[PDB]
Amino acid sequence: NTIPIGIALAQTSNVALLGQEQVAGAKIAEKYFNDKGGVNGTPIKLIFQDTAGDEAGTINAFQTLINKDKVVGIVGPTLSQQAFSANPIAERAKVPVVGPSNTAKGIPEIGDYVARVSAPVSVVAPNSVKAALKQNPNIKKVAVFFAQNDAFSKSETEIFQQTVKDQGLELVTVQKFQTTDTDFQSQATNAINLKPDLVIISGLAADGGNLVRQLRELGYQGAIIGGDGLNTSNVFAVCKALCDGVLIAQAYSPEYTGEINKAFRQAYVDQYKKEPPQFSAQAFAAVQVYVESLKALDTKNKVSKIQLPELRTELNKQLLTGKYNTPLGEISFTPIGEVVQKDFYVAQIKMEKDGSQGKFTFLK
Ligand SMILES: [Mg+2]
């Protein structure tokens, strides 16, 4: 006997450029927690249902997890775009969802069954603008790009634009693109002609990486910030040496000294031969929330005896009250499922000259 927890992430499509990191973190969590006896001796079982890259696929994954796989709760989906459409399905069904990477404004407000461990754009994004200004205090002109078809990108760009204004900078253009675009020559040239000192990009990974490369090809020599959708080493293949110097805010640090982060980090580095990425740490934290909540519930009300609909509702109620020492730091939730998290960082892509290898360097 095991306790089924659903994992609904983008395992296919270009959205898997983010999702694959999340799968890695979730698998590390499953082993970590099961090696500690699961839920008071009862192992968990992660049941993966691929969402692919769109809303329909996410709805299907959620419905399969809820109805066929009988899961006690869901971790997912990868994108805020998907969450706004699919999470209401789980809300209506009274099945908890813990978002591992959904940072758009309004996610926890979807309902009483929706929480997230991923700190939102309003608290993560501004630090990268501040970091750019530290590296070049003479930045004056800023060009902004965003993916107009993606809910998170639209939410993030609003924060970046407000931050630019509040820092007393000139917003010289806001250019739109689609996450499915590969060619940005007209928007990039439009922006370059305005002589920006800083360019900010809110998109996902393939698109964001292609845009970074093209800006550099077209002769842009100023600073670049990428938003959360570019926050993966999977961009390195796309922009190669031309990824160098991109600043990306972080809601996780490998060097955070919390005991469980040390364990998570060691497990990650031993397997993948590099530092754990944010999305992996966040996925681990989401699984952790479920395991620790299940343990607390089971101690008070043995879960093997609770029928599934009540188990789901009691698990949701429990998880919202918990305090968790996770790889992200000490976190908890507000009464509507927003994450409470203190520490944020900025990292910078450092590519080797040949362009075949790179890393994220954390700024002090
Ligand atoms: Mg909520």
UniProtKB/TrEMBL annotation:
Write out the residues that bind Mg(2+). P108, G111, V114, I336
Q: Does the keyword Ribosomal protein apply?
A: no
The membrane spanning regions, by residue number, are none
Gene Ontology molecular function, alphabetical: metal ion binding
Where is the Leucine-binding protein domain positioned along the sequence? 2-353
> Which Gene3D superfamilies does this one have?
3.40.50.2300
Sorted UniProt keywords: Metal-binding, Signal
Q: Does the record carry Transmembrane as a key word? A: no
**Which PROSITE patterns does the record associate with it?**
PROKAR_LIPOPROTEIN
Cross-referenced Pfam families: Peripla_BP_6
Summarize where pyruvate binds, as residue positions. Answer: S80, T103, D228
* PANTHER family hit by this protein: LEUCINE-SPECIFIC-BINDING PROTEIN (PTHR30483), PERIPLASMIC BINDING PROTEIN OF ABC TRANSPORTER FOR NATURAL AMINO ACIDS (PTHR30483:SF6)
The record's family statement is:
Belongs to the leucine-binding protein family.
Name of the protein in its database record = Amino acid/amide ABC transporter substrate-binding protein, HAAT family
